[PDB]
Design a protein around this ligand. Structure first.
Ligand SMILES: CC(=O)N[C@H]1[C@H](O[C@H]2[C@@H](O)[C@@H](CO)O[C@H](O[C@@H]3[C@H](O)[C@@H](O)[C@H](O[C@H]4[C@H](O)[C@@H](O)[C@H](O)O[C@@H]4CO)O[C@@H]3CO)[C@@H]2O)O[C@H](CO)[C@H](O)[C@@H]1O[C@@H]1O[C@H](CO)[C@H](O)[C@H](O[C@]2(C(=O)O)C[C@H](O)[C@@H](NC(C)=O)[C@H]([C@H](O)[C@H](O)CO)O2)[C@H]1O
Ligand code: ZN
Ligand code: ZN
Length: 197
């Protein structure tokens, strides 16, 4: 029987970004950098062998994901609107979604391999990821009634790699958008800025 194993390796990093002194008519930017580091499995769906011993072939399909909020609330109760300034070569998909951006990069498919490998790692397992992808530059629209002062805003988001191992050539699987939207947001961007007059 034909089999498919899909595992999502989630990256979890905390970082800060200084947007500086801004007036409400301006759009301060922040850069989301793809940082290689320790990834944790947060989702899987498998019906095949959990381990390839090196004696038989399987096929690889890898897709990098960034799932970013379109809006965030300040501690004092105001909305900040997250907009795309520069998404490089990322594929911006499911654009009609009200709450989140979905950025994908499908960089490996139909690749036959024999390499000994863990084909279905379980939620909570960890591994080092060293892959590199484009920065994503965002711009923030401040509401005209935002109170003046210093802001320190936590922006949680998801990033990681979906690895799809299959028994056959031509295998294709994408984590459904409704699932991607609910993957734990393990990264944090602490956005700093001062609303001036
Ligand atoms: C899910 C899917 O398969 N395609 C999505 C597409 O998914 C991509 C995308 O997310 C990228 C992001 O980087 O990653 C993967 O793609 C990888 C590579 O990037 C990509 O370059 C690579 O392309 C290969 C391909 O694998 C080879 O088969 C091909 O021969 O060569 C190229 C390389 O040059 O593939 C990699 C695979 O890992 C993801 O898979 O995302 C987009 C939008 O962002 C869409 O969501 C794609 O899905 C389709 O969209 C169109 C409409 O917009 C249709 O709905 C289409 O459906 C069919 C269908 O109805 O069944 C598929 C049929 O095959 C097609 N029939 C043909 C061409 O005869 C029909 C047809 O066009 C009819 O008009 C519609 O009925 O559409 C969806 O599959
Ligand atoms: Zn620019
Ligand atoms: Zn308001």
């Amino acid at each position: 029987m034909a089999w498919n194993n899909i595992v999502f390796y989630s990256l979890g990093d905390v970082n800060s970004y200084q947007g500086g002194n801004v007036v409400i008519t301006q759009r301060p930017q922040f850069i989301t950098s793809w940082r290689p580091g320790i990834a944790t499995v947060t989702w899987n769906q498998c019906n095949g062998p959990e381990f390839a011993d090196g004696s038989w072939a399987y096929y690889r399909e890898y897709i990098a994901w960034v799932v970013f909020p379109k809006k965030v609330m300040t501690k004092n109760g105001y909305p900040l609107f997250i907009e795309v300034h520069n998404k490089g070569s990322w594929s911006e998909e499911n654009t009609g979604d009200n709450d989140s951006y979905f950025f994908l990069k499908g960089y490996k498919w139909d690749q036959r391999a024999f390499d000994t490998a863990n084909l279905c790692q379980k939620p909570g397992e960890t591994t080092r990821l060293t892959e590199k992808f484009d920065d994503i530059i965002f711009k923030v629209a401040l509401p005209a009634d935002l109170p003046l002062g210093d802001y320190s805003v936590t922006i949680p988001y998801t990033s990681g790699i979906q690895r799809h191992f299959a028994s056959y050539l031509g295998a294709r699987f994408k984590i459904p958008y409704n699932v991607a939207k609910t993957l734990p947001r393990e990264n944090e961007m602490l956005f700093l800025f001062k609303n001036i007059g």
